[PDB]
Amino acid sequence: NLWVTVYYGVPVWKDAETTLFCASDAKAYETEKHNVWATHACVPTDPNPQEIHLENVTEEFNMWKNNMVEQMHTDIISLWDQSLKPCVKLTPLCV
Amino acid sequence: FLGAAGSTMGAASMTLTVQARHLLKLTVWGIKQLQARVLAVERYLRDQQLLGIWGCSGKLICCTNVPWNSSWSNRNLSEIWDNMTWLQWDKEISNYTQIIYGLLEESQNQQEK
Amino acid sequence: VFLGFLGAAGSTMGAASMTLTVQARNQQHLLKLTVWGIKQLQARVLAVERYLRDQQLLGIWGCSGKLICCTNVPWNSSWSNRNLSEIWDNMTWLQWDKEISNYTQIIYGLLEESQNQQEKNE
Amino acid sequence: AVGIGAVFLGFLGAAGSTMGAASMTLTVQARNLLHLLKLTVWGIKQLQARVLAVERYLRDQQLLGIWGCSGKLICCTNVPWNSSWSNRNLSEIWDNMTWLQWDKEISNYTQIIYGLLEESQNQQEKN
Amino acid sequence: LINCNTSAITQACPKVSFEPIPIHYCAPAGFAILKCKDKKFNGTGPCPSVSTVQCTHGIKPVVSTQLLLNGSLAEEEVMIRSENITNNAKNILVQFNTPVQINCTRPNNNTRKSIRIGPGQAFYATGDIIGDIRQAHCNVSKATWNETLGKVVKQLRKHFGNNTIIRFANSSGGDLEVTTHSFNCGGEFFYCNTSGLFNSTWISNTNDSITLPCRIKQIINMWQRIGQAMYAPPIQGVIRCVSNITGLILTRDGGSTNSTTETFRPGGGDMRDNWRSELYKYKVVKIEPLGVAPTRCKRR
Amino acid sequence: DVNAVDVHGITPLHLAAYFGHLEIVEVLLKTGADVNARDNRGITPLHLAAAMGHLEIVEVLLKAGADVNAFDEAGDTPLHLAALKGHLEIVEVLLKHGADVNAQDKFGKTAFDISIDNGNEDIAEVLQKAAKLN
Numbered sequence: 071n072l073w074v075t076v077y078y079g080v081p082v083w084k085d086a087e088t089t090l091f092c093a094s095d096a097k098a099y100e101t102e103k104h105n106v107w108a109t110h111a112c113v114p115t116d117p118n119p120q121e122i123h124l125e126n127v128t129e130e131f132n133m134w135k136n137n138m139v140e141q142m143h144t145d146i147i148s149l150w151d152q153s154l155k156p157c158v159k160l161t162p163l164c165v
Numbered sequence: 166f167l168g169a170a171g172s173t174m175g176a177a178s179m180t181l182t183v184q185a186r187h188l189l190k191l192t193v194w195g196i197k198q199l200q201a202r203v204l205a206v207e208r209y210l211r212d213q214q215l216l217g218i219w220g221c222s223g224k225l226i227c228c229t230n231v232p233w234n235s236s237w238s239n240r241n242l243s244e245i246w247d248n249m250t251w252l253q254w255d256k257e258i259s260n261y262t263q264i265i266y267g268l269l270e271e272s273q274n275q276q277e278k
Numbered sequence: 279v280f281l282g283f284l285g286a287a288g289s290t291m292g293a294a295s296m297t298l299t300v301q302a303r304n305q306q307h308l309l310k311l312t313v314w315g316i317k318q319l320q321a322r323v324l325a326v327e328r329y330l331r332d333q334q335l336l337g338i339w340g341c342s343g344k345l346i347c348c349t350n351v352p353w354n355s356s357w358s359n360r361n362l363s364e365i366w367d368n369m370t371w372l373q374w375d376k377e378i379s380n381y382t383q384i385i386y387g388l389l390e391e392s393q394n395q396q397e398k399n400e
Numbered sequence: 401a402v403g404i405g406a407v408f409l410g411f412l413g414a415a416g417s418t419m420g421a422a423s424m425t426l427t428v429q430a431r432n433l434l435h436l437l438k439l440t441v442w443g444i445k446q447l448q449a450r451v452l453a454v455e456r457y458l459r460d461q462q463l464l465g466i467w468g469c470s471g472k473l474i475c476c477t478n479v480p481w482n483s484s485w486s487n488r489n490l491s492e493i494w495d496n497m498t499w500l501q502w503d504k505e506i507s508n509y510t511q512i513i514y515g516l517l518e519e520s521q522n523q524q525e526k527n
Numbered sequence: 528l529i530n531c532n533t534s535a536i537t538q539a540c541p542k543v544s545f546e547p548i549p550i551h552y553c554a555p556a557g558f559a560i561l562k563c564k565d566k567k568f569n570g571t572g573p574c575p576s577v578s579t580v581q582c583t584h585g586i587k588p589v590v591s592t593q594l595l596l597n598g599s600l601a602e603e604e605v606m607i608r609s610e611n612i613t614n615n616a617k618n619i620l621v622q623f624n625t626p627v628q629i630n631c632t633r634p635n636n637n638t639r640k641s642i643r644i645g646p647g648q649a650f651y652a653t654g655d656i657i658g659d660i661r662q663a664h665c666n667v668s669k670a671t672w673n674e675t676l677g678k679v680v681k682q683l684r685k686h687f688g689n690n691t692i693i694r695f696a697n698s699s700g701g702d703l704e705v706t707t708h709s710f711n712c713g714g715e716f717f718y719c720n721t722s723g724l725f726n727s728t729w730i731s732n733t734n735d736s737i738t739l740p741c742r743i744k745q746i747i748n749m750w751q752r753i754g755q756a757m758y759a760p761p762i763q764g765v766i767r768c769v770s771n772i773t774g775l776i777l778t779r780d781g782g783s784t785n786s787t788t789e790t791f792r793p794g795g796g797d798m799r800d801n802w803r804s805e806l807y808k809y810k811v812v813k814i815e816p817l818g819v820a821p822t823r824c825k826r827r
Numbered sequence: 828d829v830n831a832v833d834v835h836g837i838t839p840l841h842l843a844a845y846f847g848h849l850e851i852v853e854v855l856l857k858t859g860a861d862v863n864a865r866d867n868r869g870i871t872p873l874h875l876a877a878a879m880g881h882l883e884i885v886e887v888l889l890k891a892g893a894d895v896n897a898f899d900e901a902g903d904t905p906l907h908l909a910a911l912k913g914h915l916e917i918v919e920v921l922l923k924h925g926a927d928v929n930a931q932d933k934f935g936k937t938a939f940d941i942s943i944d945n946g947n948e949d950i951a952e953v954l955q956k957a958a959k960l961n
């Protein structure tokens with residue numbers, strides 16, 4: 071027969087969904103709207119980003135089912151909603 | 166703790182025992198490093214509190230008397246220890262993870278009795 | 279940790295034990311954001327330190343790692359003078375330590391002495 | 401360094417005392433455990449020191465709990481004591497010697513002591 | 528009759544400068560980002576070399592149809608990527624190995640006049656003085672872009688037969704956002720004709736700049752929600768923006784013809800495709816250290 | 828702004844009638860734009876709507892109160908711009924509103940003579956029918 075044992079300290083990752091904070095090296099001296107959104111909503115950039123490469127690894131990538139881009143799409147929608155306002159805007163609202 | 170994942174199952178089982186041993190800019194990056202370290206410690210204590218139910222608290226390698234269905238592993242299990250890694254094995258039993266945790270907790274419940 | 283505990287505080291203690299178990303299974307804007315972040319981090323660090331202190335106190339009592347632990351100290355009628363049938367239904371957890379706040383220290387010390395006696399028996 | 405970093409030196413007192421007295425007083429000493437630039441730039445450094453103290457304490461506690469003694473200050477283990485490590489009486493070490501000189505005695509051996517404790521706990525979990 | 532009543536909001540135009548700034552994304556606490564450094568990424572499948580990073584590289588949030596102006600360069604050669612092959616309903620995305628530098632000028636003299644005689648002189652003059660405000664012509668170098676097209680047809684030989692010829696047509700038709708290259712410099716949205724840019728057919732064993740006209744439209748169909756908008760009139764000063772071309776979006780016309788001559792048209796229209804073109808090799812993960820493994824071990 | 832004007836006199840209603848979009852035209856005439864807005868050259872939005880060949884825009888402008896015989900710097904009615912480029916239905920709608928067939932520009936040319944000069948006899952016959960029934 072077989073019995074269940076538990077193991078800790080095991081290097082296992084799982085894919086998931088979380089909110090990702092934006093990073094942008096913006097100085098905000100200019101009155102540009104894209105610059106001031108980057109100052110107001112994002113942090114400055116990494117000086118020394120830590121790059122760790124693995125020798126043996128197996129990974130199935132599916133970028134068409136990638137979630138990461140779905141949040142960034144709404145981020146750019148918010149970016150140009152706060153950055154640019156048209157003279158006249160129209161949207162259909164149907165009951 | 167995610168490093169050295171290229172080794173197989175039987176090698177990771179040994180190496181886990183080896184594992185057992187400009188001011189606003191700097192503040193806003195150091196605060197995120199502090200979030201990483203504090204949530205790492207909080208996740209470690211939360212996982213130890215979870216493991217305290219199963220009776221294996223503080224122990225990296227443990228053994229229980231919980232019965233294992235042959236349908237979950239659906240494999241002879243002799244060759245999963247030498248040539249198959251942890252990452253594939255976790256995806257083999259991803260659908261059947263909650264029910265065996267529920268099996269452990271009630272098994273420890275009659276272990277109390 | 280401590281923030282999630284305080285919800286459903288005044289519910290009945292018999293159901294509070296079970297929900298406790300399934301609980302414990304588990305540029306001015308930027309400056310304002312960072313200062314409230316470091317306040318939240320200080321709160322979390324002191325929460326971890328208080329959890330460490332109380333876990334080590336339970337290790338003194340021999341109940342380390344156990345949220346629900348059984349001891350061998352006999353209950354004394356002079357401590358509470360309350361019936362067993364209605365204490366788990368018609369009384370919440372918050373009123374219980376309000377009902378015993380002068381007598382918790384002698385219980386703490388006698389529990390520590392009973393754990394020391396049990397260790398001495400080995 | 402407030403709190404956990406203070407109690408890392410909290411048990412450092414009575415270091416030259418009798419070997420039998422410090423082991424009893426471990427329980428008592430463990431029971432005795434209890435403007436812009438100041439809070440943005442200065443505060444994160446003391447936060448780093450405190451979280452470093454917490455990380456060191458959990459690392460030491462995990463290394464102690466390898467051997468099945470999680471949360472126990474004093475624990476008895478089923479490892480037999482080899483006579484080559486000490487070759488001395490039990491009376492004179494607990495009545496005459498101190499902890500510092502004793503670790504000076506067994507600094508050569510404590511590396512294989514920790515490994516043999518890990519192997520004995522592994523053999524205990526195997527059966 | 529279903530009551531579909533449009534709602535409109537009028538607010539004064541800021542008329543401000545607008546430039547894209549490269550931003551980075553980082554993982555929060557308790558999460559990591561995996562990056563694939565393999566050149567033959569293939570889109571879907573296994574990657575041999577996966578390395579962990581704490582932040583992304585420079586991502587420029589640029590909106591453009593049928594071409595990508597500011598983006599990352601391909602490492603070794605040209606690769607194409609598609610979700611399905613010969614599905615003829617999903618976009619095909621191309622990253623160029625070498626950058627194609629494109630420059631575009633708009634005349635700001637506003638002195639072009641014609642001596643019209645006869646009736647309708649006032650309306651002609653009004654049309655001329657309006658069209659001088661809204662007219663542009665962009666440059667594309669033939670020598671570099673023809674070489675990149677020769678590279679991409681060589682890469683396209685592998686996926687489709689390489690026995691029958693392929694050819695390029697212009698946009699099929701529809702909304703003006705898709706049929707014309709819509710790109711913004713200085714807050715003004717330019718609709719560029721790309722009919723002469725994709726004009727040549729290609730058969731196997733195979734200094735001047737072609738100008739491409741661009742008309743300025745004040746009414747745009749916005750890409751966020753469906754609807755229409757209106758913006759400020761263009762600035763009287765000259766606007767000139769100089770940038771690469773890094774990506775290309777193509778829709779393949781499915782062929783039931785027995786000759787099987789493949790036809791490719793410039794597609795685009797979805798900016799989610801554009802930001803998938805720059806986040807193709809990145810994944811976000813979390814760490815789960817606790818695991819189980821059955822073995823023949825008895826308790827106590 | 829609903830009534831915004833540039834240095835050359837063009838409001839957004841002129842460009843809305845020019846580019847052939849009915850929703851912006853309706854919205855502007857709902858919010859209160861000037862239906863008889865004139866630039867430096869005397870062009871009304873009915874001129875740009877009639878000349879390019881957008882029918883519904885002309886109808887929305889005329890039921891909002893646009894002038895049918897409005898004159899530009901050159902004296903051209905929207906009927907002359909409608910008959911300039913062979914738009915029969917716009918001419919028919921402008922005579923249904925009551926455009927002047929005897930109106931002349933500064934060059935002394937009527938809609939009759941520019942319909943003859945452009946060689947579109949079908950518009951000229953309809954204009955002759957409208958002048959006979961006046």
Ligand SMILES: *[C@@H]1O[C@H](CO)[C@@H](O[C@@H]2O[C@H](CO)[C@@H](O[C@@H]3O[C@H](CO[C@H]4O[C@H](CO)[C@@H](O)[C@H](O)[C@@H]4O)[C@@H](O)[C@H](O[C@H]4O[C@H](CO)[C@@H](O)[C@H](O)[C@@H]4O)[C@@H]3O)[C@H](O)[C@H]2NC(C)=O)[C@H](O)[C@H]1NC(C)=O
Binds near residue numbers: 546714769771
């Ligand atoms: C892909 O990436 C490239 C590289 O960034 C972009 O190319 C840029 O394109 C913009 C056009 O949108 C260029 O910006 C223009 O700069 C002109 C030069 O003036 C600059 O320099 C002086 C002196 O340093 C500054 O004082 C000034 O503020 C500018 O920074 C300006 O003349 C242009 O307009 C300005 O003046 C008018 C006058 O009326 C104002 O109304 C405007 O608001 C504005 O202030 C304009 O700003 C920029 O130079 C290009 N960068 C280069 C060549 O390196 C591509 O645009 C980008 N692709 C896309 C699709 O965005």
Ligand SMILES: *[C@@H]1O[C@H](CO)[C@@H](O[C@@H]2O[C@H](CO)[C@@H](O[C@@H]3O[C@H](CO)[C@@H](O)[C@H](O)[C@@H]3O)[C@H](O)[C@H]2NC(C)=O)[C@H](O)[C@H]1NC(C)=O
Binds near residue numbers: 611612613614615
């Ligand atoms: C990728 O695209 C290909 C086409 O280029 C897809 O293959 C096609 O899939 C459809 C749907 O299953 C098949 O239709 C089926 O045909 C049978 C008769 O052969 C019929 O009985 C079924 O009811 C159904 O209609 C089609 O035959 C097939 N092959 C072609 C067109 O050559 C493929 O499914 C796509 N894959 C993905 C993952 O999108």
Ligand SMILES: *[C@@H]1O[C@H](CO)[C@@H](O[C@@H]2O[C@H](CO)[C@@H](O[C@@H]3O[C@H](CO)[C@@H](O)[C@H](O)[C@@H]3O)[C@H](O)[C@H]2NC(C)=O)[C@H](O)[C@H]1NC(C)=O
Binds near residue numbers: 697
């Ligand atoms: C892609 O290329 C084709 C071929 O040049 C383009 O088709 C052309 O489209 C224009 C209108 O966009 C046609 O002009 C129209 O012709 C009719 C003929 O009766 C006339 O009545 C209209 O007033 C107008 O002038 C043109 O004839 C047509 N040419 C051919 C050969 O079909 C097509 O528009 C291009 N698409 C894009 C997106 O560039």
Ligand SMILES: *[C@@H]1O[C@H](CO)[C@@H](O[C@@H]2O[C@H](CO)[C@@H](O)[C@H](O)[C@H]2NC(C)=O)[C@H](O)[C@H]1NC(C)=O
Binds near residue numbers: 352353354356
């Ligand atoms: C239970 O509580 C009672 C009352 O508190 C304890 O009674 C003790 O009674 C003697 C009588 O001589 C006093 O000297 C003690 O001081 C009392 N102790 C206390 C705590 O007040 C009794 O000892 C307690 N213990 C049990 C379990 O019977």
Ligand SMILES: *[C@@H]1O[C@H](CO)[C@@H](O[C@@H]2O[C@H](CO)[C@@H](O)[C@H](O)[C@H]2NC(C)=O)[C@H](O)[C@H]1NC(C)=O
Binds near residue numbers: 482484
């Ligand atoms: C105590 O430790 C010594 C080594 O310090 C052990 O001596 C070994 O004994 C075995 C046979 O029992 C010999 O083969 C080895 O050569 C000896 N030396 C070493 C370095 O291993 C001794 O056996 C131990 N005694 C107990 C009871 O554990």
Ligand SMILES: *[C@@H]1O[C@H](CO)[C@@H](O[C@@H]2O[C@H](CO)[C@@H](O)[C@H](O)[C@H]2NC(C)=O)[C@H](O)[C@H]1NC(C)=O
Binds near residue numbers: 569571610
């Ligand atoms: C590149 O990705 C495609 C994705 O479709 C792979 O195509 C596979 O082809 C086999 C052939 O029968 C199918 O059974 C699979 O279902 C297809 N998809 C996947 C995801 O494997 C193609 O093999 C890949 N090529 C390389 C070199 O990686």
Ligand SMILES: *[C@@H]1O[C@H](CO)[C@@H](O[C@@H]2O[C@H](CO)[C@@H](O)[C@H](O)[C@H]2NC(C)=O)[C@H](O)[C@H]1NC(C)=O
Binds near residue numbers: 721722723
């Ligand atoms: C893009 O340019 C092509 C020319 O290269 C335009 O095609 C012309 O369209 C006009 C308008 O009907 C015709 O009179 C010409 O005969 C066409 N020429 C050719 C060679 O086809 C095309 O219309 C332009 N696209 C847009 C959207 O304006």
Ligand SMILES: *[C@@H]1O[C@H](CO)[C@@H](O[C@@H]2O[C@H](CO)[C@@H](O)[C@H](O)[C@H]2NC(C)=O)[C@H](O)[C@H]1NC(C)=O
Binds near residue numbers: 626628770
């Ligand atoms: C268009 O592409 C060229 C070629 O890569 C870019 O030139 C590079 O610019 C970066 C940024 O300063 C330098 O680090 C490289 O050394 C340059 N390479 C060469 C070959 O000159 C150019 O910047 C791109 N244009 C834009 C607007 O980004």
Ligand SMILES: *[C@@H]1O[C@H](CO)[C@@H](O)[C@H](O)[C@H]1NC(C)=O
Binds near residue numbers: 125126171
């Ligand atoms: C893992 O990588 C090392 C690198 O030295 C290699 O020797 C070993 O064979 C690899 N393990 C495999 C491929 O299972």
Ligand SMILES: *[C@@H]1O[C@H](CO)[C@@H](O)[C@H](O)[C@H]1NC(C)=O
Binds near residue numbers: 233234235
């Ligand atoms: C397998 O699982 C079933 C539940 O589906 C259980 O009743 C049984 O005891 C398990 N073990 C064996 C050996 O069948």
Ligand SMILES: *[C@@H]1O[C@H](CO)[C@@H](O)[C@H](O)[C@H]1NC(C)=O
Binds near residue numbers: 241243
């Ligand atoms: C499992 O492997 C062993 C060793 O090779 C073999 O004897 C046994 O028959 C196998 N069982 C199954 C079910 O394949």
Ligand SMILES: *[C@@H]1O[C@H](CO)[C@@H](O)[C@H](O)[C@H]1NC(C)=O
Binds near residue numbers: 256257260
């Ligand atoms: C887990 O469940 C999903 C649900 O559809 C299924 O697609 C997948 O194949 C399952 N994994 C197995 C059986 O290993």
Ligand SMILES: *[C@@H]1O[C@H](CO)[C@@H](O)[C@H](O)[C@H]1NC(C)=O
Binds near residue numbers: 286289290
């Ligand atoms: C609060 O009391 C009411 C009494 O009717 C009960 O229905 C409800 O469940 C209680 N809420 C909680 C959280 O116990």
Ligand SMILES: *[C@@H]1O[C@H](CO)[C@@H](O)[C@H](O)[C@H]1NC(C)=O
Binds near residue numbers: 361362363364
């Ligand atoms: C109260 O205590 C008495 C004596 O222990 C017991 O018989 C009774 O059931 C309890 N409960 C009630 C509601 O009286």
Ligand SMILES: *[C@@H]1O[C@H](CO)[C@@H](O)[C@H](O)[C@H]1NC(C)=O
Binds near residue numbers: 364367368
């Ligand atoms: C609970 O106690 C209250 C008085 O605090 C009383 O009125 C009520 O009847 C009691 N209910 C039960 C369940 O005994």
Ligand SMILES: *[C@@H]1O[C@H](CO)[C@@H](O)[C@H](O)[C@H]1NC(C)=O
Binds near residue numbers: 379380
């Ligand atoms: C508990 O002790 C305090 C301290 O004086 C006293 O006021 C209170 O009445 C005591 N409560 C009980 C129930 O004896």
